[PDB]
């Protein structure tokens, strides 16, 4: 209060451990309705490693997998539409274009492929990664696909001419996740050297390096509104303000260990898939873990198989498609007829002992 400022006379009056803590108790998080399992889909011969939703009209999603084949699943009924084979090794990331009928998919077989979704064939193969390619993001409005992998550089691919146009060299380890934003910084990347880079693609250099995580930043996710990115190390999840490189918030992720995937809803629901199945939903603007679920594997499988590997919401934001190690695709529904009363979620309780805030 004012007695803190008049006796322990500060120089900032915000950089005190108490004044930060009392404003956290001063504010309440937005309530969100919890999430429940609604459909389990068993269709792959291996792990599901990446899920992409149809960005236009939301009919279907596609799950690239460990059995080297992508399968197209209908969202509503859950039925299997078609199977897209054409890699020889494990498909790591799949991303669909919104302006194009094009599907880009990168495996660990060092190949970046495009797919004519009017024809369901492989067209326009890309070439040049020295090692397995982890991730792809289609740049919005610019006609570039950003691919990155164990190579440790991001190669900016022109679509039409298949040219490694811009190579982004800043990292020290394998890049786990890459994102594309419409303005500068146009490429957001995260690697195993515990850094998150903000790339000025014209100059080819880094605008800002975010060295706040301890261990390999395994997953990032862009917020569909409000222009921010949220990156996950093994212990902590930090939302980042783009165009300043500012640390917006630290989430209340404690004792979660290894966060494999992230996805942000329009309704400020951040999903954090853990390798220990323990899947958690965080308020985005605050950082409150308001729900923490655990999954059931199958009739028979190992205990390690309980692990979420990849996740995204649909276009409406009311469905959550997660792919797990137990060869399953789990659809998570946010249940209706839940109110702030009788479903409060976990209690908003920040502490001093964790230095997170």
């Amino acid at each position: 209060s004012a007695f803190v400022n008049k006796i322990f006379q500060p120089e900032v009056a915000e950089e005190l451990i108490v004044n930060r803590y009392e404003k956290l108790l001063s504010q309440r998080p937005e309530w969100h309705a919890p999430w429940k399992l609604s459909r389990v889909i068993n269709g792959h011969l291996g792990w599901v490693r990446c899920v992409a939703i149809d960005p236009v009209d939301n009919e279907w999603f596609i799950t690239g997998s460990n059995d080297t084949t992508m399968k197209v699943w209908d969202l509503a009924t859950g039925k299997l539409k078609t199977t897209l084979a054409g890699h020889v090794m494990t498909v790591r990331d799949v991303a669909v274009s919104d302006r194009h009928p094009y599907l880009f998919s990168v495996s660990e077989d060092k190949t970046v492929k495009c797919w004519d979704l009017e024809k369901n064939q492989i067209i326009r193969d890309y070439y040049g990664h020295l090692s397995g390619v982890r991730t792809v993001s289609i740049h919005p409005t610019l006609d570039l696909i950003a691919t990155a992998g164990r190579d440790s550089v991001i190669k900016l691919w022109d679509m039409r001419t298949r040219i490694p146009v811009i190579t982004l060299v800043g990292h020290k380890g394998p890049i786990n996740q890459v994102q594309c934003t419409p303005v500068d910084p146009q490429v957001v990347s995260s690697s195993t050297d515990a850094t998150v880079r903000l790339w000025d693609v014209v100059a080819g250099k880094t605008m800002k390096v975010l060295t706040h995580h301890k261990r390999s930043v395994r997953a990032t996710a862009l917020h569909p509104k409000e222009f921010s990115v949220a990156s996950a190390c093994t212990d902590d999840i930090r939302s980042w303000g783009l165009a300043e490189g500012s640390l917006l918030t630290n989430f209340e992720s404690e004792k979660t260990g290894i966060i494999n995937t992230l996805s942000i809803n329009q309704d400020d629901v951040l999903f954090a898939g853990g390798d220990n199945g323990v899947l958690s939903f965080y308020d985005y603007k605050s950082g409150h873990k308001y729900q923490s679920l655990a999954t059931r594997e199958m009739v028979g499988s190992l205990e390690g198989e309980r692990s979420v590997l990849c996740s995204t919401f649909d276009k409406t934001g009311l469905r959550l498609i997660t792919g797990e190690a137990d060869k399953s695709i789990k659809i998570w529904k946010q249940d209706e007829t839940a109110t702030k009363e009788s479903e409060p979620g976990l209690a908003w309780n920040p502490n001093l002992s964790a230095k997170r805030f």
Partner: protein, 39 residues
């Protein structure tokens, strides 16, 4: 010895500072030269 695992992969930082050659590959020939735009 002489048969080892990898401690780190070959980085693309090294090949970026090289000078290019401009050899002409069969798969880099012009093909599918027109992009299709969604409605």
């Amino acid at each position: 010895t002489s048969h080892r695992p990898q401690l780190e992969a070959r980085s693309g930082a090294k090949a970026a500072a090289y000078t290019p050659t401009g050899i002409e590959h069969a798969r880099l020939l012009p093909g599918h030269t027109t992009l299709k735009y969604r409605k």
